[PDB]
């Protein structure tokens, strides 16, 4: 919330296991964009905002 929550991002996130995805635009505490996926498993994982598979999964979720 008050610093960059993610240092690294994950490679192959299964879209059939993601419960939700949060998109954090650049803010006064993190100059970058951050994409955090909450699984059904409860666990949280990070995804690159510029990645094509990420932009696709997010786009597929709006439908």
């Amino acid at each position, epitope marked *: 919330e008050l610093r960059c929550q993610c240092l*690294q991002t994950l490679h192959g996130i299964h879209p059939k296991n993601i419960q939700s995805v949060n998109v954090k635009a650049p803010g006064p505490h993190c100059a970058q964009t951050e994409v*955090i996926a909450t699984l059904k498993n409860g666990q949280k*994982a990070c995804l690159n905002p510029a990645s094509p598979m990420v932009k696709k999964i997010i786009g597929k979720m709006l439908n």
Partner: antibody, heavy 126, light 108 residues
Framework: QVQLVQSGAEVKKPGASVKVSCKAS????????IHWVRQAPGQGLEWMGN????????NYNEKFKSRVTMTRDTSTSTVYMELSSLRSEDTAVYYC???????????????????WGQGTLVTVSS | EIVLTQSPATLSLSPGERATLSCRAS??????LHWYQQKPGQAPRLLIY???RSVSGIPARFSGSGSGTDFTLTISSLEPEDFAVYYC?????????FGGGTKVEIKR
């Protein structure tokens, strides 16, 4: 060997620029954030900003934002701190420090800066 | 922004005595408060992380505690090598902020 090795002492003139380097060794470079913290002579510690070794995404203190640029070179496992428009007030010992390890899992319970470089004295004088 | 206030500025004690150091944050920093030691001519050395957790290679005499906004560093029994400057540092939010320092001086 688990180390943070920095570049040597620098004497710069007001208005000029300094580029300090920090070479990571004996550990997973992408697993730790690298911070730049300065100490003015006889003073406390001031955070200037950090960089993510993987992405090269850097975060800066608003006080230094406009004059500072942090970069990384994955091939050498080195990070850089470039301070511009140097003033007398910038005379300090500049340290690089690592915070982690961390991965793709976001956290709310942070580690401390467990490993520091030997520091770089930068003298700003005409 | 966050302001960490260290107290007292100087602490005068003898070897074997117990040292108690204060750090008061301007507002909540959760438990992301860390303790560092600094000797003349050297980089700060991390002692205690996340209010009370232990650090590899750090002797047992060092311990920390804290109640939301107020933090404490305790040195059970002072050794000669413990006389130095101690900083508290927050990394809950950015920018990271450090306190003014506490000098632990030999009493005579």
């Amino acid at each position: 060997q688990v180390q943070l090795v920095q570049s040597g002492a620098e004497v710069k003139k007001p208005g000029a620029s300094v580029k300090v380097s920090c070479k990571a060794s004996g550990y997973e470079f992408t697993s730790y954030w690298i911070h730049w913290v300065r100490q003015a002579p006889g003073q406390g510690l001031e955070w200037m900003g950090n960089i993510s070794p993987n992405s090269g995404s850097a975060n800066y203190n608003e006080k230094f934002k406009s004059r500072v640029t942090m970069t990384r070179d994955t091939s050498t496992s080195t990070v850089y701190m470039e301070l511009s428009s140097l003033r007398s007030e910038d005379t300090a010992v500049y340290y690089c420090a690592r915070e982690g390890p961390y991965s793709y899992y976001p956290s709310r319970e942070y580690y401390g800066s467990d490993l520091w470089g030997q520091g770089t004295l930068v003298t700003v004088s005409s | 922004e966050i302001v960490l206030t260290q107290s007292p500025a100087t602490l005068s004690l003898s070897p074997g005595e117990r040292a108690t150091l204060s750090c008061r944050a301007s507002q909540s920093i959760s438990n992301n408060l860390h303790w560092y030691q600094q000797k003349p001519g050297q980089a700060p050395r991390l002692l205690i992380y996340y209010t009370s957790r232990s650090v590899s290679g750090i002797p047992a005499r060092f311990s920390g505690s804290g109640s939301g906004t107020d933090f404490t560093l305790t040195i059970s029994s002072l050794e000669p090598e413990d006389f130095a400057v101690y900083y508290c540092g927050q990394n809950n939010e950015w920018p990271e902020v450090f306190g003014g320092g506490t000098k632990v001086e030999i009493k005579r």
